[PDB]
Amino acid sequence: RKQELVTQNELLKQQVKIFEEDFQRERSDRERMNEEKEELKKQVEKLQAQVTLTNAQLKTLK
Amino acid sequence: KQELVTQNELLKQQVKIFEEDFQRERSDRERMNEEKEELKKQVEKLQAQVTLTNAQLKTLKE
Amino acid sequence: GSGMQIFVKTLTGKTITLEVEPSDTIENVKAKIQDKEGIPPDQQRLIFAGKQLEDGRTLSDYNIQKESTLHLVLRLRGGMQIFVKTLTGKTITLEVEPSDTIENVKAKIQDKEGIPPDQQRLIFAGKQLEDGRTLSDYNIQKESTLHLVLRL
């Protein structure tokens, strides 16, 4: 059990690499989703300013 | 070998930890999505609302 | 015939053989694996003689001869993931690819959540998803959201 332990080693080094790759891809996905959510917040403001802009335009009818 | 046994469970230890850190960001996206859906609803009511108040600005101006 | 047998073993010791050719590209051999043990090519890297193999390369390119053992490492994820919200309030996360039938989706919701596909109904954009069509068919791509409703 030593060429075994070596052959198992070499492949086990290869796995740690893969799971790093996939962890960092998952990270970059969440960060992308985070900025996606951050710009839907932007839209909410865009569409809130518009309404009270419209609401202040029509309210002045006294 | 003894070096290899210590070497290999260290690598298995990394594999496991990276697998867990994968789920970290994975379930993090799951919360991010529900956060984005909660906001996609929130955009649409305003999207209609701006037209609601625009259709009662032009008519209201006459 | 230029055919030849080949072994490709997992990291756990679950070993599998395939009938392949020197002609075959590496992506082809990955496609062949998916066919026997449903394992998408975006979830597998192949190693021979301590070298990662490029998808679009032959066995001749890497000089793999008759009955050469090759090493298969599994990935934690693939290219494409989609979300599924239930009515009780939870989102699960699925590892998918565009060419999966709606059947294949419910199959791995049964694996994740334990609800038989017989009782699962899936909705995207207000439409009831028919079993034999793909994700491509409904224009379902990455990070999209489906809704899960049980009936019958």
CSV table of N, CA and C in Angstrom, one decimal, chain B residues 15-60:
chain,number,residue,atom,x,y,z
B,15,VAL,N,-10.2,18.9,0.5
B,15,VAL,CA,-11.3,18.5,-0.3
B,15,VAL,C,-12.6,18.8,0.4
B,16,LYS,N,-12.7,18.3,1.6
B,16,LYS,CA,-13.9,18.4,2.4
B,16,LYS,C,-14.3,19.9,2.7
B,17,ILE,N,-13.2,20.6,3.2
B,17,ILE,CA,-13.4,22.0,3.5
B,17,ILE,C,-13.8,22.9,2.3
B,18,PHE,N,-13.2,22.6,1.2
B,18,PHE,CA,-13.6,23.3,-0.1
B,18,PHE,C,-15.0,22.9,-0.5
B,19,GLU,N,-15.4,21.7,-0.3
B,19,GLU,CA,-16.8,21.2,-0.6
B,19,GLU,C,-17.8,22.0,0.3
B,20,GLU,N,-17.4,22.2,1.6
B,20,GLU,CA,-18.2,23.0,2.5
B,20,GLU,C,-18.3,24.4,2.1
B,21,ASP,N,-17.2,25.0,1.8
B,21,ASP,CA,-17.1,26.4,1.3
B,21,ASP,C,-17.9,26.6,0.0
B,22,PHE,N,-18.0,25.5,-0.8
B,22,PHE,CA,-18.9,25.5,-2.0
B,22,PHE,C,-20.3,25.7,-1.6
B,23,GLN,N,-20.8,24.9,-0.6
B,23,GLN,CA,-22.2,25.1,-0.1
B,23,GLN,C,-22.4,26.4,0.5
B,24,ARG,N,-21.4,27.0,1.2
B,24,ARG,CA,-21.4,28.3,1.7
B,24,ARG,C,-22.0,29.3,0.7
B,25,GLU,N,-21.3,29.4,-0.4
B,25,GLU,CA,-21.7,30.3,-1.5
B,25,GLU,C,-22.9,29.8,-2.3
B,26,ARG,N,-23.1,28.5,-2.3
B,26,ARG,CA,-24.3,27.9,-3.0
B,26,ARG,C,-25.6,28.3,-2.3
B,27,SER,N,-25.7,28.0,-1.0
B,27,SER,CA,-26.9,28.5,-0.2
B,27,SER,C,-27.0,30.0,-0.1
B,28,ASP,N,-25.8,30.7,-0.3
B,28,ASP,CA,-25.8,32.1,-0.3
B,28,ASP,C,-26.5,32.7,-1.6
B,29,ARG,N,-26.3,32.0,-2.7
B,29,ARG,CA,-27.0,32.4,-3.9
B,29,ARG,C,-28.5,32.1,-3.8
B,30,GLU,N,-28.9,31.0,-3.1
B,30,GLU,CA,-30.3,30.7,-2.8
B,30,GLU,C,-31.1,31.8,-2.1
B,31,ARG,N,-30.4,32.4,-1.1
B,31,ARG,CA,-30.9,33.5,-0.4
B,31,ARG,C,-31.0,34.8,-1.3
B,32,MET,N,-29.9,35.0,-2.1
B,32,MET,CA,-29.8,36.1,-3.0
B,32,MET,C,-30.9,36.1,-4.1
B,33,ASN,N,-31.3,34.9,-4.5
B,33,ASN,CA,-32.4,34.7,-5.5
B,33,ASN,C,-33.7,35.1,-4.9
B,34,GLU,N,-34.1,34.5,-3.8
B,34,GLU,CA,-35.3,34.9,-3.0
B,34,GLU,C,-35.4,36.4,-2.7
B,35,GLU,N,-34.2,37.0,-2.4
B,35,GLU,CA,-34.0,38.4,-2.3
B,35,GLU,C,-34.3,39.2,-3.6
B,36,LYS,N,-33.9,38.6,-4.7
B,36,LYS,CA,-34.1,39.2,-6.1
B,36,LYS,C,-35.6,39.0,-6.6
B,37,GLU,N,-36.2,37.9,-6.2
B,37,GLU,CA,-37.6,37.7,-6.5
B,37,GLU,C,-38.5,38.6,-5.8
B,38,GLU,N,-38.3,38.7,-4.4
B,38,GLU,CA,-38.9,39.7,-3.6
B,38,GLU,C,-38.9,41.1,-4.1
B,39,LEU,N,-37.8,41.4,-4.9
B,39,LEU,CA,-37.6,42.7,-5.5
B,39,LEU,C,-38.2,42.8,-6.9
B,40,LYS,N,-38.2,41.7,-7.7
B,40,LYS,CA,-38.9,41.7,-9.0
B,40,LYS,C,-40.4,41.9,-8.9
B,41,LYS,N,-41.0,41.4,-7.9
B,41,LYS,CA,-42.4,41.7,-7.5
B,41,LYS,C,-42.5,43.3,-7.3
B,42,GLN,N,-41.6,43.8,-6.5
B,42,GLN,CA,-41.6,45.2,-6.1
B,42,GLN,C,-41.4,46.2,-7.2
B,43,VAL,N,-40.6,45.8,-8.2
B,43,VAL,CA,-40.5,46.6,-9.4
B,43,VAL,C,-41.7,46.7,-10.2
B,44,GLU,N,-42.4,45.5,-10.4
B,44,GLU,CA,-43.5,45.5,-11.3
B,44,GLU,C,-44.7,46.3,-10.9
B,45,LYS,N,-45.0,46.3,-9.6
B,45,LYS,CA,-46.1,47.1,-9.1
B,45,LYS,C,-45.9,48.6,-9.3
B,46,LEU,N,-44.6,49.0,-9.2
B,46,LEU,CA,-44.2,50.4,-9.5
B,46,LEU,C,-44.2,50.7,-11.0
B,47,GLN,N,-43.9,49.6,-11.8
B,47,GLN,CA,-43.9,49.7,-13.3
B,47,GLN,C,-45.3,50.0,-13.8
B,48,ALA,N,-46.3,49.3,-13.2
B,48,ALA,CA,-47.7,49.6,-13.5
B,48,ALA,C,-48.1,50.9,-12.9
B,49,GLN,N,-47.7,51.1,-11.6
B,49,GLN,CA,-48.0,52.4,-10.9
B,49,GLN,C,-47.6,53.6,-11.6
B,50,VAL,N,-46.4,53.6,-12.3
B,50,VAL,CA,-46.0,54.8,-13.0
B,50,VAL,C,-46.9,55.2,-14.2
B,51,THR,N,-47.4,54.1,-14.9
B,51,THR,CA,-48.4,54.3,-16.0
B,51,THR,C,-49.7,54.7,-15.4
B,52,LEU,N,-50.1,54.1,-14.3
B,52,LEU,CA,-51.4,54.5,-13.6
B,52,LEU,C,-51.4,56.0,-13.3
B,53,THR,N,-50.3,56.5,-12.8
B,53,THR,CA,-50.2,57.9,-12.5
B,53,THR,C,-49.8,58.8,-13.7
B,54,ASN,N,-49.3,58.2,-14.7
B,54,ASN,CA,-49.1,58.9,-16.0
B,54,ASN,C,-50.4,59.0,-16.8
B,55,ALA,N,-51.2,58.0,-16.8
B,55,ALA,CA,-52.5,58.0,-17.5
B,55,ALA,C,-53.5,59.0,-16.7
B,56,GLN,N,-53.3,59.2,-15.4
B,56,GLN,CA,-54.0,60.2,-14.7
B,56,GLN,C,-53.3,61.5,-14.5
B,57,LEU,N,-52.3,61.8,-15.3
B,57,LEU,CA,-51.6,63.1,-15.4
B,57,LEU,C,-52.1,63.8,-16.7
B,58,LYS,N,-52.0,63.1,-17.8
B,58,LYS,CA,-52.5,63.6,-19.1
B,58,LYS,C,-54.0,63.9,-19.1
B,59,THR,N,-54.8,63.0,-18.6
B,59,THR,CA,-56.2,63.1,-18.5
B,59,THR,C,-56.5,64.2,-17.5
B,60,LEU,N,-55.8,64.2,-16.4
B,60,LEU,CA,-56.0,65.2,-15.4
B,60,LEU,C,-55.5,66.6,-15.8
